[PDB]
């Protein structure tokens, strides 16, 4: 009755300690495909509509241990296609349970670290199922890994011909328009989504984002003039990355004659105050001693951003 999570931690604890031992990573698909029967083929029956291991007990989260097994031994293409026809069996069909929220994240995070590892195409069909199985009222962690979900897919969704990118041209920042996020990690979920927004060039932004979820991000950013403190060590860098969004708006609105902002001078208002606070982000004390990374936030990530302050003064000037 008192061995719920500690005894369940011993699986990856055994897995990572042997991962931290010795040579090449063919063990990433050796013991895993052996152990792949223990959950996924243990959930293979699908008694309608309930899998055999998944929808009986809550301890069907060894996929996170399989994600930990995906995180165990990193070379070079092994466990993913070894779980490929297993996930096309299990995780393709046993993911649209439409609530799933007990490790619905780690279900996707299994595919995320799969897509993080290597490959191009087998997960690129699986993102259509994530394009299929989506939600706008997901859980706060289910929205959180969803921001990571297209993020790990974005590298092959910007591989050469972008391969999945216009599949979510309606499943764009519309999904970031699932607003009213939770506490600062869910605020940082948008910051990772801002970090996810670096690719995908700016032809048709008005149907996809219209900088309107970015205005909702600017709504967070207009708050962010004084919304955070000492997680501002995250959040002002997230504001410094929000300064890239105006530079991204500089590469979109001041690209060819859009200006992109109708009811957003109110939004660019405190953004201009945040542009006033852009170079004034690390200007409380400003001593000449720096341990490893202190003053470079509003100096070097303000070198481009004071330009981006003038490029917040480019589509609509200062």
């Amino acid at each position: 009755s008192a061995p719920g999570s500690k005894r369940r931690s011993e699986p990856p604890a055994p897995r990572p300690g042997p991962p931290p031992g010795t040579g090449h990573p063919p063990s990433k698909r050796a013991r895993g495909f052996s152990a792949a029967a223990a959950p996924d083929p243990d959930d293979p029956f699908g008694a309608h509509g309930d899998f055999t291991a998944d929808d009986l007990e809550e301890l069907d989260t060894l996929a996170s241990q399989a994600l930990s097994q995906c995180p165990a031994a990193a070379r070079d293409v092994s466990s993913d296609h070894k779980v490929h026809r297993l996930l096309d069996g299990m995780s393709k069909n046993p993911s649209g349970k439409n609530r799933e929220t007990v490790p619905i994240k780690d279900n996707f995070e299994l595919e995320v670290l799969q897509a993080q590892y290597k490959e191009l195409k087998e997960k690129m069909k699986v993102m259509e199922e994530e394009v299929l199985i989506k939600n706008g009222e997901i859980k706060i962690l289910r929205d959180s890994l969803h921001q990571t979900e297209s993020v790990l897919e974005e590298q092959r969704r910007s591989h050469f011909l972008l391969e999945q990118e216009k599949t979510q041209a309606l499943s764009d920042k519309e999904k970031e328009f699932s607003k009213k996020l939770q506490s600062l990690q869910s605020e940082l979920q948008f910051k990772d989504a801002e970090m996810n927004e670096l690719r995908t060039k700016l032809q048709t932004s008005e149907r996809a984002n219209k900088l309107a979820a970015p205005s909702v991000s600017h709504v967070s950013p207009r708050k962010n003039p004084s919304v955070v403190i000492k997680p501002e060590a995250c959040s002002p860098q997230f504001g410094k990355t929000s300064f890239p969004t105006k530079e991204s708006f500089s590469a979109n609105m001041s690209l060819p004659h859009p200006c992109q902002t109708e009811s957003g001078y109110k939004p660019l208002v405190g953004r201009e105050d945040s542009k006033p606070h852009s170079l004034r982000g690390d200007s409380i004390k400003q001593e000449e001693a720096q341990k490893s990374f202190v003053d470079s936030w509003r100096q070097r990530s303000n070198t481009q951003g004071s330009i981006l302050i003038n490029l917040l003064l480019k589509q609509p000037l200062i």
Binding site: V151, L152, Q155, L198, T241, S250, R300, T303, Q304, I307
Partner: protein, 165 residues
């Protein structure tokens, strides 16, 4: 004629780094070098498609190899040139391909660091690793690699930093 205008001083910038016997001539070389990024600041970029975009990046990467050749013994001048090179890619509105090529430039030394496990030698390559160490500081000054943090980013190069560990 922009590349021909870029051809005018870059070989002269390749010339002033030849004699590494300065007595404030590297100061007279950095005053050409640090102004050259300021000459690269207002113009000589933001231009035609990926051939000419790589062509402005070619003599950039050629002078970055000359900056990589600047291993002994003007260290911080190359570090001044490190963010100066990063200022171009910051002002590129582009060069995420070149950032992946900078990630490949990180991967150029990474497998070389992985080859430095069984065999580290040729102290210039130890010095060019120190030139790449300020490029890691330039990657620290880049921080648009965290704009590629969605793509399973420089944790790879942190493993190279673990290989530098």
């Amino acid at each position: 004629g922009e590349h021909g205008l870029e051809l005018a001083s870059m070989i002269p910038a390749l010339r002033e780094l030849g004699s590494a016997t300065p007595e404030e001539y590297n100061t007279v070389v950095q005053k050409p070098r640090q102004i050259l990024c300021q000459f690269i600041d207002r113009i000589l970029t933001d231009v035609n498609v990926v051939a000419v975009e790589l062509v402005k990046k070619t003599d950039s990467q050629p002078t970055s190899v000359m900056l990589l050749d600047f291993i002994q013994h003007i260290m911080k001048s190359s570090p001044l040139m490190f963010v100066n090179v990063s200022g171009s890619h910051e002002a590129k509105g582009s060069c995420i391909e070149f950032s992946n090529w900078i990630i490949t430039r990180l991967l150029r030394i990474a497998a070389t660091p992985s080859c430095h496990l069984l065999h580290k030698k040729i102290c210039e390559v130890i010095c060019s690793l120190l030139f790449l160490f300020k490029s890691k500081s330039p990657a620290i000054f880049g921080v648009l690699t965290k704009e590629l943090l969605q793509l399973f980013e420089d944790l790879v190069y942190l493993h190279r930093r673990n290989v530098m560990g």
